[PDB]
Design a protein around this ligand. Structure first.
Ligand SMILES: Cc1cccc(F)c1CN1C[C@H](c2ccc(-c3cnn(CC(N)=O)c3)cc2)[C@@H](N(C)C)C1
Length: 358
């Protein structure tokens, strides 16, 4: 990787999120979105390092702070869609062509810290909230499918979550130091999703009933000792970090325990490795993976990038490379790989954007 360009957005506030559109059509240039201040902005990557500015969506409320975005597509038309959310607790579905807000969703109106789309169903959107809950939405029928919370749910802000490969289960994490597993391939949850697709408010009198899921299928506070701010599945294993200069690779149960036989009472975890780094001990810093999950990237609070090659026989054998540029000194909140892995974008607390090309 070599650094080929940078720019800075005019708001001078942190960019909290960046995502390449992995649903961009064949023959179209690569496009990524950034979120920070009260806006979302799209850029196109071109040759000779050019980052071409397209168009932003700017919230009507100057006090909105967007924290997260996620791409999907319209399941009928195939056209890409961009979901954004933040401090106002409003999910907006944006048409990236025109930057029009097509529609929006509100739960209880508390800050949304992350959005993720289901890996097999482009209509299923997961939000994680300052109010300690996760919410699963069906953006085809505009329904809240389920809320994941309760006293055995998270007891402080949820900061991150991730679906596994097939979208059979979710791992969430947050300010309570815990990582929690929620299965969504239960008979109850599969039925709820089916019913969400059968719901049309114009053809019935009932409101749509959301599931209240009050018990995770596994919980641990034994991995980290501070706010857990990013989580990703790596097959049946988990990658997660806190502010302790480490990403931990771990699994529920003992070494030979199958993830789908784990009981909610399981008290053990197994640590398969840990990737240490420096100067990333402030709260709220995300790591990202490429499409194939061959690579892992994390930026630190002084503008250094760490990239791990996970194409090795066991997690602890990961090979680290580091990327620095003398002008890049601000905290990197998130990174994104292009779908082909040829470009890595980093975004920063000073509103700067850094492009690295293979
Ligand atoms: C990015 C991220 C990463 C991982 C998990 C996550 F959940 C999030 C999302 N975060 C948005 C919120 C937030 C974070 C930072 C600031 C802030 C203010 N000033 N600065 C530095 C400056 N230089 O201005 C930074 C303000 C609000 C955090 N919540 C819990 C308070 C969660």
């Amino acid at each position: 990787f070599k650094c080929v360009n940078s720019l800075k957005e005019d708001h001078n506030q942190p960019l909290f999120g960046v995502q390449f559109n992995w649903h961009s059509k064949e023959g179209d240039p690569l496009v990524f979105a950034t979120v920070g201040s009260n806006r979302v902005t799209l850029y196109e990557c071109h040759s000779q390092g050019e980052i071409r500015l397209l168009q932003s969506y700017v919230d009507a409320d100057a006090d909105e702070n967007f924290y997260t975005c996620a791409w999907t597509y319209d399941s009928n038309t195939s056209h890409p869609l961009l979901a954004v959310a933040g401090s106002r607790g409003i999910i907006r579905i944006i048409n990236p062509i025109t930057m029009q807000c097509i529609k929006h969703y509100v739960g209880h109106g508390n800050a949304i810290n992350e959005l993720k789309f289901h890996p097999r169903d482009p209509n299923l959107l997961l939000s994680v909230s300052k109010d300690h809950a996760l919410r699963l939405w069906n953006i085809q029928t505009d329904t809240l499918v389920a809320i994941f919370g309760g006293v055995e749910g998270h007891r402080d802000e949820v900061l991150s979550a991730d679906y596994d490969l097939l979208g059979e289960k979710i791992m969430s994490c947050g300010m309570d130091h815990s990582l929690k597993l929620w299965r969504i391939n239960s008979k109850r949850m599969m039925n709820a999703i089916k019913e969400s697709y059968d719901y049309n408010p114009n053809k019935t009198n009932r409101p749509f009933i959301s599931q209240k899921i009050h018990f995770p299928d596994f919980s641990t506070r034994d991995i980290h000792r501070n706010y857990v701010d990013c989580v990703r599945w790596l097959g049946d294993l988990i990658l997660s970090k806190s502010c302790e200069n480490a990403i931990v690779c771990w699994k529920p149960g003992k070494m030979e325990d199958d993830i789908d036989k784990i009981k909610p009472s399981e008290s053990n975890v197994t640590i398969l490795g840990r990737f240490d780094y420096s100067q990333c001990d402030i709260w709220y810093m995300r790591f990202s993976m490429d499409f194939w999950q061959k690579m892992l990237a994390l930026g630190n609070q002084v503008g250094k990038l760490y990239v791990w090659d996970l194409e090795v026989e066991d997690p602890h054998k990961a090979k680290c490379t580091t990327l620095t540029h003398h002008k890049c000194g601000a905290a990197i909140r998130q990174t994104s790989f292009s779908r082909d892995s040829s470009i890595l974008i980093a975004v920063c607390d000073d509103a700067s954007i850094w492009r690295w090309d293979r």
